[PDB]
RNA sequence: GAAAUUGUUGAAAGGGAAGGGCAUUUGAUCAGACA
RNA sequence: AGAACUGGCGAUGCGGGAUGAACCGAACGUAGAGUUAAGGUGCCGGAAUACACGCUCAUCAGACACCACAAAAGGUGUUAG
RNA sequence: GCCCUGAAAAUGGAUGGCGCUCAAGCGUGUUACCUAUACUCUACCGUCAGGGUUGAUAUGAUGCCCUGACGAGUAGGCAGGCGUGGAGGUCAGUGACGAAGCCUAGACCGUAAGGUCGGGUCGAACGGCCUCUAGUGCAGAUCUUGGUGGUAGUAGCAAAUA
RNA sequence: UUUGCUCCACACAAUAUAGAUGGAUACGAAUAAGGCGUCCUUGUGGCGUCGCUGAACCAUAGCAGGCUAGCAACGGUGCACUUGGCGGAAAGGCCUUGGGUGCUUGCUGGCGAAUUGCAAUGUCAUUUUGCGUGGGGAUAAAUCAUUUGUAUACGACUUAGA
């Protein structure tokens, strides 16, 4: 039968699997869309919290 | 039913001492053999008069060939057909060479356009229209138009092999 | 008959091509299908799109990673249609599907090679004119294939180079035809004409 | 050195093994007919073992014959072998298992004399 | 997107050279030696590879690393990463 | 059953190929007018042609000749039955009933 | 020359079978160039070899042969029935076989 | 001094069971025959 | 749930109906050859991507018995009357 | 008539699937082709029935031979055979130069029950045939007794301040 | 880390073969429209021809293909080299210059080929590995243990250590 009090989903499923990362250095899965008119520059940098 | 033929079937009561020489009813039957022809003869005569195969006799079964199997004719066919809900009469025009070919096309056309079957169809009359303008139907009249010509676009071959090397063409 | 048969999937119907291909495979012919983004399906684009959405909502409810995998590229759509026509859960079917190869576009080892067609699967011969048809690249892009632009760019490049090759080949063919034509008067040529050749 | 016989046919060279003799050790391979109400083997559904029956019977010309075309007759001594003196084409001798080696060599000598075939001549022979 | 080739510098520091090892104290520290020797007069093979990148290479990424020794961590091993370049002319990118 | 009106050719071929007698409960291949005479000389029949004659020109002794004849054990027809479905009437596009003279073709296929 | 072939090359298709039961005592062969039984009638009675290679040499050869013959036609698309002395091993579904031109009647 | 059950060695196979039947291949192994 | 007449399952395999106790076909000694039943012949799958006449386009097509469903009512959708 | 509206359910999803659209759909027709343990012919096995065969050397006449047909099966009935412990008889049977038992992806006979041989181990008795006799044949019975597994080197071996 | 590892050439074994045995012979697009050739005023142009299938084209004669002699022509093809260019979608191949060398069935000839004994695939392919000889080339890491805590049930991860 049905839930009896319609409450919402605990947790976010698009953050699954909630597993260990392969490295401490996370992957940049995307860079900004390139504009072939501006100067040449880096899109990102590396630092330490 | 099959590739058709036309038979004339002549039939008779059995003679009694009371009434000898009965009246010799005949019918033109479209059928694929003499057995089916005699069956249909008795079907229709049973319907019309007090006769059956047991009290009756078949006097002669004769095949009727076309007198002119090369002259292209325009037949009109008067038909009776049982539908699912009801039974109906029809007049169809068929342009063909022979009565028997016309009847073949008629059975196929009624099966196609009315889902009617041989058991369901009675052919009342098949008649040649001698003069044009007595034709009632456009799908026949447009071939009686004067000096008729037309192409066959999109010509498709039939290939012996499975693979080809040309990317063929539908020319004509 | 050839050891490897290269089929140009342009203008072709998916199910019919898959049928003849599957049978050729099981009978032992190595086949490679190319330019499968230009493959055709009968019925309008919206119809086939709804059909694919129906396929795409089918999934194992306790693990969609277990479920039926919905492959989005045209090559793998064709492979789906075709492994449904092979008994792929056996060794014979595995071997057949190893004889098979499918590609989007025409990659380098197979663009310098002759492409055959299959006339019992071509849409321009098999469909009635007026009947609406769908293109697999369009469908696959609608349902989530990304590399439509890339294949187009690369195919343009290929067509340029192939046209150059054909210009050269046509010139050489012209020369050979002129030479044979001037040679088609002598006694040897007359004897060959008598013998059919 | 036998009579001329036809080629020998068998119709089933394969031992009729009992159902589930492979599955359980307690079930031996010796044939037993399944007598169960739901037995696929008794009902002879497709894909199941064959049951023995008399149509697999061997031709009577070729029954009991060995591939040499002799019928094998067990022998314990020279008297039992002189029984076969006059039937060397039909019958071959087989020395019994419980015979000693010295008696075996005696029997084999007498059989070589009388022209009788012996199926187990290498039994209990010092090499 | 597929990596076609990747060009390195002549002199790599002992931090990225460290990144290429799991046991630096035991090693002969032989890494990028034959590459530093591939330079050797002008960078013939190197300009070959850069020309390949210029000709091909829809996009271009630069390999960089960190100055962990300037950082107060006890790690000594730098973090290598690919970073995309944005700007016209993959030629200009690779020349940069 | 499929039945109809046979011809001399069918009768002759059937009696010559599938023709077997009933003698002392036994199905005897005829193969000799001596046999036929030994069993039917009571009735003047003394040859396989005398048999066929009684059969086709139904005679005083048709009963005895026909019961002497063991039932003809025919094969299936070699070109098939001609129809897709057998168990309709011949008139409906089947195989059973009277097929007055189309039975000869069937029986020759079966023989 | 280049060619030394006195055999027409064919392909071993399935065994004789219904939808769910096969018969290994009869094999089906597809012959090249044949597309009708009227053309396969030429090939009836001709002898067939399935030639295969092993690793163990028996009597001077690592090449072994199964001999058969064509028995009758199959279907309408030139497929042919064959029967071999010892039946074919069912891993040769799609394998090449050699239809020789003897026994000849031309 | 059986079996279940186990160890060692050898041989073979192994993509969510194994086992069986018909048929052949491959490997191993084996009986029978000309005077 | 209960009767009638037959046939069957039970007690029975086989080919077909994807699958099924009883439906279709047909009843099993062991083998060989041939022909067929019912059902089928794009591929899975043995066998015509055969031939012929027509109807149908479904932004919920349809697809051959028992059998696994669909109605009243409607539609210048199209077809024939 | 086909198509459409009418036409709404609960895991994901079934003209059997793929897929099919002048179709691989619907209606009808024509042929070819596929194939069952069915039909035909042949062989072999058994069963039944009908018959022949004193001729002897010399034999099983409860034999040999010929002919024809048949062959599904639970419960159940009958028949012919296989095997086990013991009894009478017989083979002047086997056997410490090795009985019986045990093992043996080694061989042979029999439709089968089962029998026979070879090799190994073994260490004292055992068998074939004609007959008698029965505490005579196991897969089950939450069967009896005994032994052994997987579970599994797992649960766990943590109250009582050390 | 015993003078081991690897590439190439040759030789010998083993390994198996989803399975050669003349050639996978390269435009693109349309199809109620196109290919080829040709001409001009270069176009959505004019003229001619083609297609109705690849049953085409190419190659193909020689002891599984031998040894020799000329004629004609300066062509064709193979091998190993050599020049230069194009190749990135899986380029790993395509084209090209030059010379050398072999063959040439384009034509005419000469010798040989028997006995595998009336057929038996009658073996003339590809792959993988190993051991030998010849040359060429290069002379590292990872794990355990110790340690760290950006980590952690244990593994694992992250670090450090001549």
């Amino acid at each position: 039968s049905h839930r009896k009090y319609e409450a919402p989903r605990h947790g976010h499923l698009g953050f699954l699997p909630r597993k260990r990362a392969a490295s401490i250095r996370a992957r940049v899965k995307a860079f900004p869309k390139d504009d072939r008119s501006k100067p040449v520059a880096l899109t990102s940098f590396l630092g330490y919290k | 039913m099959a590739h058709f033929k036309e038979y004339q079937v002549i039939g008779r009561r059995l003679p009694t001492e009371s009434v000898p020489e009965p009246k010799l009813f005949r019918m033109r039957i479209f059928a694929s053999n003499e057995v089916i022809a005699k069956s249909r003869y008795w079907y229709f005569l049973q319907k019309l008069h007090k006769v059956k195969k047991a009290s009756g006799e078949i006097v002669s079964i004769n095949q009727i060939n076309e007198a002119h199997p090369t002259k292209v004719k325009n037949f009109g066919v008067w038909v009776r057909y049982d539908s699912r809900s009801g039974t109906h009469n029809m007049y169809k025009e068929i342009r063909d060479v022979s009565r028997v070919a016309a009847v073949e096309t008629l059975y196929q056309d009624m099966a196609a356009r009315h889902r009617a079957r041989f058991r369901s169809i009675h052919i009342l009359k098949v008649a040649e229209i001698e003069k044009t303008a007595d034709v009632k139907r456009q799908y026949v009249k447009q071939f009686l138009t004067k000096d008729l010509k037309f192409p066959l676009p999109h010509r498709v071959q039939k290939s012996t092999k499975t693979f080809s090397y040309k990317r063929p063409s539908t020319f004509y | 008959v050839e050891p490897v048969v290269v089929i140009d999937g342009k203008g072709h119907l998916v199910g019919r091509l898959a049928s003849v291909v599957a049978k050729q495979l099981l009978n032992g012919q190595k086949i490679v299908v190319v330019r499968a983004e230009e493959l055709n399906i009968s019925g309008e684009f919206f119809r086939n799109k709804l059909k694919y959405h129906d396929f795409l909502r089918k999934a194992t409810a306790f693990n969609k990673t277990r479920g039926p995998f919905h492959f989005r590229a045209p090559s793998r759509i064709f492979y789906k249609a075709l492994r449904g026509m092979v008994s792929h859960k056996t060794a014979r079917g595995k071997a057949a599907l190893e004889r098979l190869k499918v590609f989007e576009g025409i990659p380098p080892p197979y663009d310098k090679k002759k492409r055959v067609v299959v006339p019992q699967a071509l849409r321009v011969l098999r469909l009635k004119p007026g009947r609406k048809y769908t293109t697999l690249g369009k469908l696959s892009t609608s349902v989530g294939w990304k590399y439509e632009d890339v294949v187009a760019k690369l195919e343009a490049k290929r067509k340029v180079s192939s046209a150059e090759y054909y210009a050269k080949k046509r010139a050489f063919t012209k020369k050979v035809a002129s030479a044979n034509a001037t040679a088609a008067e002598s006694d040897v040529a007359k004897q060959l004409a008598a013998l059919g050749y | 050195a036998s009579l001329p016989h036809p080629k020998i046919v068998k119709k089933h060279t394969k031992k009729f093994k009992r159902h589930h003799s492979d599955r359980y050790h307690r079930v031996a391979e010796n044939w037993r007919k399944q007598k169960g109400i739901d037995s696929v083997v008794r009902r002879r559904f497709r894909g199941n073992i064959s049951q023995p029956k008399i149509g697999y019977g061997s031709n009577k010309k070729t029954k009991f014959l060995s591939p040499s075309g002799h019928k094998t007759f067990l022998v314990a001594n020279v008297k039992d072998l002189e029984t076969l003196t006059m039937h060397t084409k039909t019958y071959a001798a087989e020395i019994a298992h419980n015979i000693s080696a010295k008696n075996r060599v005696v029997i084999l000598a007498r059989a070589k004399a009388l022209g009788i075939k012996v199926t187990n001549p290498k039994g209990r022979l010092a090499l | 997107l597929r990596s076609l080739t990747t060009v390195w510098a002549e002199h790599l520091s002992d931090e990225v050279k460290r990144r290429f090892y799991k046991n630096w104290y035991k090693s002969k520290k032989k890494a990028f030696t034959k590459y530093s020797a591939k330079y050797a007069q002008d960078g013939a093979g190197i300009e070959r590879e850069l020309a390949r990148i210029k000709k091909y290479a829809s996009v271009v990424r630069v390999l960089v690393h960190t100055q962990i020794r300037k950082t107060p961590l006890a790690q000594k091993k730098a973090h290598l990463a690919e970073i995309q370049l944005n700007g016209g002319s993959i030629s200009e990118k690779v020349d940069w | 059953v499929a039945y109809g009106y046979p011809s001399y050719s069918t009768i002759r071929q059937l009696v010559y190929k599938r023709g077997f007698g009933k003698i002392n409960k036994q199905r005897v291949p005829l193969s000799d007018n001596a046999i036929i005479e030994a069993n039917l000389g009571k009735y003047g029949i003394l040859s396989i042609d005398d048999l066929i004659h009684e059969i086709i020109t139904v005679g005083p002794h048709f009963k005895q000749a026909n019961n002497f004849l063991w039932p003809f054990k025919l094969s299936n027809p070699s070109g098939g039955w001609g129809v897709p479905r057998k168990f309709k009437h011949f008139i409906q596009g089947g195989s059973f009933g009277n097929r007055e003279e189309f039975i000869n073709k069937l029986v020759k296929s079966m023989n | 020359a280049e060619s030394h072939r006195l055999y027409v090359k064919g392909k071993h298709l399935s065994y004789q079978r219904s939808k769910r039961v096969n018969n290994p005592n009869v094999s089906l062969i597809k012959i090249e160039g044949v597309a009708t039984p009227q053309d396969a009638q030429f090939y009836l009675g001709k002898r067939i070899a399935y030639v295969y290679r092993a690793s163990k040499e028996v009597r001077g050869s690592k090449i072994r042969v199964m001999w058969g013959k064509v028995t009758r036609t199959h279907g309408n698309s030139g497929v042919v029935r064959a029967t071999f002395r010892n039946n074919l091993p069912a891993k040769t579904f799609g394998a090449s076989v050699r239809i020789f031109l003897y026994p000849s009647n031309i």
Side-chain angles (χ1 to χ4, degrees), chain F residues 1-100:
Chain F
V1 301
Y3 72 91
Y5 309 123
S7 72
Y8 180 75
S9 169
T10 63
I11 296 163
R12 167 158 180 281
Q13 291 177 11
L14 280 183
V15 174
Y16 278 28
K17 196 183 164 190
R18 315 309 193 129
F20 286 82
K22 185 175 88 185
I23 320 179
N24 284 311
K25 188 58 65 68
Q26 306 247 312
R27 185 181 166 259
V28 179
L30 292 168
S31 85
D32 206 73
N33 299 312
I35 286 148
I36 289 148
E37 193 176 10
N39 320 133
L40 278 63
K42 301 159 70 66
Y43 302 120
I45 294 143
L46 54 86
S47 58
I48 204 164
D49 310 316
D50 287 328
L51 269 180
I52 292 159
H53 179 249
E54 287 277 312
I55 295 302
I56 196 156
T57 66
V58 174
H61 297 309
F62 178 81
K63 175 168 213 191
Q64 295 82 355
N66 193 39
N67 216 343
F68 181 79
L69 285 169
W70 196 273
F72 294 106
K73 284 174 75 187
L74 305 173
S75 177
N76 268 315
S78 196
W81 303 84
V83 289
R85 276 179 55 74
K86 270 168 73 176
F87 309 109
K88 310 170 145 177
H89 206 275
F90 181 70
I91 294 160
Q92 281 200 352
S95 292
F96 70 75
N98 198 348
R99 54 166 80 200
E100 298 199 13

Side-chain angles (χ1 to χ4, degrees), chain C residues 128-177:
Chain C
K128 187 159 168 193
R131 296 288 192 212
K132 291 177 68 60
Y133 57 96
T134 290
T135 312
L136 211 58
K138 285 281 278 159
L139 181 62
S140 291
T141 314
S142 87
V143 303
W145 184 48
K146 319 190 189 164
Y147 317 96
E148 200 180 350
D149 284 359
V150 180
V151 178
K153 185 185 294 201
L154 298 169
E155 276 285 276
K157 199 210 288 182
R158 187 189 57 74
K159 288 163 185 239
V160 165
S161 302
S162 183
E164 294 168 30
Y165 159 80
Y166 183 68
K168 288 193 184 193
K169 201 191 191 204
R170 205 173 40 196
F172 199 70
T173 307
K174 195 185 251 184
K175 283 170 78 200
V176 178

Side-chain angles (χ1 to χ4, degrees), chain E residues 11-28:
Chain E
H11 299 299
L12 260 66
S13 170
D14 276 317
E15 296 180 329
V16 284
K17 275 173 82 87
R18 226 179 245 265
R19 182 66 182 186
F20 271 81
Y21 292 100
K22 288 289 194 81
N23 298 299
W24 171 265
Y25 81 116
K26 265 151 65 175
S27 60
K28 306 285 190 74

Side-chain angles (χ1 to χ4, degrees), chain B residues 114-160:
Chain B
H114 304 291
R115 305 302 191 289
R117 276 90 168 176
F118 186 97
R119 72 171 175 265
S120 275
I121 288 155
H122 310 243
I123 282 156
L124 317 176
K125 192 178 185 190
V126 182
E128 199 202 343
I129 298 153
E130 295 102 11
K131 286 209 282 283
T132 64
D134 296 331
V135 172
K136 315 292 206 305
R137 296 282 144 80
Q138 286 299 130
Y139 61 82
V140 173
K141 189 182 285 184
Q142 65 169 359
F143 291 98
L144 308 174
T145 299
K146 168 59 160 278
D147 199 339
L148 188 71
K149 312 168 153 215
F150 55 90
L152 306 174
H154 213 76
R155 187 263 302 271
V156 172
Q157 308 283 338
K158 295 281 96 166
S159 191
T160 293

Side-chain angles (χ1 to χ4, degrees), chain E residues 2-96:
Chain E
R2 191 174 69 79
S3 41
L4 184 87
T5 180
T6 91
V7 186
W8 298 86
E10 194 175 2
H11 299 299
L12 260 66
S13 170
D14 276 317
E15 296 180 329
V16 284
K17 275 173 82 87
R18 226 179 245 265
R19 182 66 182 186
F20 271 81
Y21 292 100
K22 288 289 194 81
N23 298 299
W24 171 265
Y25 81 116
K26 265 151 65 175
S27 60
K28 306 285 190 74
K29 290 145 191 86
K30 281 195 90 84
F32 294 96
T33 58
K34 298 176 159 57
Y35 207 97
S36 180
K38 263 162 70 71
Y39 268 81
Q41 56 197 27
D42 309 317
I46 286 150
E47 294 290 324
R48 280 188 199 281
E49 286 191 329
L50 271 78
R52 288 208 276 147
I53 295 166
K54 284 198 178 79
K55 199 174 175 183
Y56 315 113
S58 296
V59 307
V60 173
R61 285 186 198 170
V62 167
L63 286 153
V64 310
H65 78 86
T66 56
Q67 284 167 323
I68 193 82
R69 61 179 184 74
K70 302 195 164 291
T71 312
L73 311 179
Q75 198 177 332
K76 294 193 193 167
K77 180 198 286 228
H79 293 89
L80 203 62
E82 270 176 29
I83 296 169
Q84 195 150 294
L85 263 51
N86 280 19
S89 185
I90 51 168
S91 169
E92 289 172 349
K93 302 191 206 282
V94 65
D95 297 328
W96 187 95

Side-chain angles (χ1 to χ4, degrees), chain G residues 17-79:
Chain G
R17 58 174 290 171
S18 302
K19 194 192 297 211
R20 286 169 208 290
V21 195
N22 61 4
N23 190 18
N25 305 291
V26 175
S27 287
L28 315 181
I29 313 300
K30 185 49 157 184
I31 302 159
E32 273 189 22
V34 187
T36 40
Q38 290 83 350
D39 295 313
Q41 278 280 323
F42 179 87
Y43 291 101
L44 288 201
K46 306 311 200 276
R47 277 165 80 68
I48 309 183
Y50 174 57
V51 184
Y52 56 105
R53 293 164 176 285
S55 318
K56 194 183 78 188
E57 173 168 11
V58 298
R59 296 179 171 228
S61 189
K62 291 156 170 281
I63 293 151
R64 315 196 193 158
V65 184
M66 304 196 182
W67 282 103
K69 58 204 194 147
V70 177
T71 50
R72 53 176 281 189
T73 68
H74 197 63
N76 293 312
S77 309
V79 174

Side-chain angles (χ1 to χ4, degrees), chain D residues 1 12 14 20 22-23 25 47-49 67-68 117 119 122:
Chain D
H12 207 264
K14 174 161 156 103
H20 284 348
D22 57 308
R23 187 147 166 137
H25 279 293
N48 291 113
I49 56 166
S68 62
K117 197 184 168 174
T119 76
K122 301 162 187 156

